[PDB]
């Protein structure tokens, strides 16, 4: 009954920290761990928009929410044009058909392996390949995807992107050893499919090599897999080999000439610190700070070159610090002693003494703020939001708008913050104003956030390395 699931969230208990904060499309997660076995809305916009699209618009802040882990579920993929909708990736036409039924389209269909050919029974499609040029039925129709790639061989084929019946056939083939996924041009190269189906596709070189040192494997189940999120990775080392650099996967004890390539999701990097934490046997030896950023932009990267000593140990830590969010509320929080929602702490113009349960998995010393979150969205197409012809492209803006909190020290396990605050009179409204002005009739707000944040210096794990012998 379980596509592995249950093996999931089980590793999860075990092997993740005790405020760890896991997440998955629709809230899976929670809804098999809480009602079968004892997001909100407007973030499933903001985590559509990451998997059904690709490039720059689908680097989400997942930072703001300290997400550490995210777990795909490769049977989503049965769900994927609501979830390509809601990400903004198609129209209100190809998700669900118009007025008279027409239109729609199939987001994504996995196509199995059956003997030499790939095949998905339900849908009536067949990919036969042994033919040297890639044979392609859906129905009785004979059909010729965009293009056809196929991993790892890395090849890839064009095609007329049509079927024998003359009509459009925007669709592009991806074929594995194990499986092939057919998709709309719209999401050809979803993040989805990157995460799910382990096909590296996308149209903006390197951005995959990237995505990837954000997004580890950290552990497989059925059809589950859960990854470990780190809005800043090292997807690329190299090293100085002989007045010419040359890309590395494990690093030696001693001197080093090294330039690392920092892939930021999300966010930018502000004033932090990188480190290298030898590591002896999961038990930290020694920390060499390496360098200061003090400003990369998260959609325009660029390598640091690095000059480092190494003592011995087993493994190195490249990790990065940096203000970020952290700790979790254990209970609801109370305002004069009234309990009242987390994510809607205080109304604007309001005041309060506010109670908090707070747990981390360490010692932190944090600044607390009451930080707004809008998601919403804008209609990029389309006469009016009842024209078929919409499409629309989720937005999420966070700012934060007072100190309540200074210096506070925050220490391993539960902890109690009562502060007094004020929400300035007319912030949330005002941005809403600014909001309705750049968008009118184009804007759908979906949710406002206002929240308090614990704010502090945190560890980014960015890339792991075993330490190797230069001989073998
Ligand atoms: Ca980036
Ligand atoms: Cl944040």
Same mark, same amino acid.
């Given at each position: 009954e379980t596509s592995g699931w249950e093996d999931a969230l089980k590793w999860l208990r075990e092997n993740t920290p005790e405020y760890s904060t896991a997440t998955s499309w629709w809230d899976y997660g929670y809804w098999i761990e809480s009602s079968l076995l004892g997001h909100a809305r407007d973030r499933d916009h903001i985590l559509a928009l990451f998997l059904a699209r690709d490039g720059?618009?689908?680097?989400? #802040?997942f930072e703001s929410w300290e997400l550490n882990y995210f777990l795909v579920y490769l049977n989503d993929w049965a769900k994927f044009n609501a979830i390509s909708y809601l990400g903004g990736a198609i129209t209100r036409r190809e998700y669900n058909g118009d007025e008279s039924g027409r239109g729609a389209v199939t987001t994504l269909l996995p196509l199995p392996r059956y003997g030499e050919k790939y095949v998905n029974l339900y849908a009536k499609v067949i990919v036969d390949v042994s033919n040297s040029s890639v044979k392609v039925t859906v129905g009785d129709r004979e059909c010729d995807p965009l293009m056809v790639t196929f991993t790892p061989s890395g090849k890839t084929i064009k095609g007329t992107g049509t079927c024998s019946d003359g009509n459009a056939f925007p669709y592009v083939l991806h074929l594995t050893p194990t499986i092939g996924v057919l998709a709309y041009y719209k999401v050809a190269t979803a993040n989805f499919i990157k995460l799910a189906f382990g096909v590296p596709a996308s149209t903006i070189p390197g951005f995959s090599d990237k995505l990837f040192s954000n997004f580890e494997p950290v552990y497989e189940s059925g059809n589950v897999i859960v990854y470990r999120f780190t809005p800043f990775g090292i997807y690329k080392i190299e090293e100085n080999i002989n007045g010419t650099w040359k890309q590395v996967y494990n690093l030696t004890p001693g001197k080093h000439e090294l330039k690392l390539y920092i892939s930021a999701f999300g966010r930018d990097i502000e004033n932090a610190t990188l480190y290298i934490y030898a590591i002896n046997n999961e038990k930290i030896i020694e920390k060499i700070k390496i360098a200061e950023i003090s400003h990369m932009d998260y959609l325009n990267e660029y390598p640091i070159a690095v000059n480092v000593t190494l003592p011995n140990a087993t493994s190195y830590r490249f990790v990065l610090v940096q203000k970020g969010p952290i700790g979790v509320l254990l209970d609801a929080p109370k305002v004069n002693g009234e309990i009242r929602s987390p994510t809607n702490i205080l109304r604007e113009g309001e005041s309060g003494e506010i109670e908090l349960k707070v747990g981390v998995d360490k010692d932190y010393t944090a600044d607390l703020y009451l930080r707004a979150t809008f998601i919403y969205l804008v209609?990029?197409?389309?006469? #009016?939001?009842? #024209?078929?012809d919409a499409a629309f492209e989720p937005q999420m803006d966070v700012f934060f708008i007072?100190?309540?909190?200074?210096n506070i020290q925050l220490k391993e396990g539960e902890n109690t913050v009562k502060v007094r605050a004020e929400l300035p009179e007319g912030v949330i409204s005002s941005y809403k104003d600014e909001l309705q002005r750049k968008y009118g009739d184009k804007l759908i707000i979906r949710g406002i956030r206002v929240e308090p944040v614990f704010i502090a210096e945190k560890e980014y794990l960015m890339l792991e390395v075993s330490a190797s012998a230069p001989h073998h």
């Open positions: 720059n618009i689908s680097e989400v #802040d209609r990029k197409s389309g006469k #009016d939001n009842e #024209d078929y007072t100190k309540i909190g200074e």
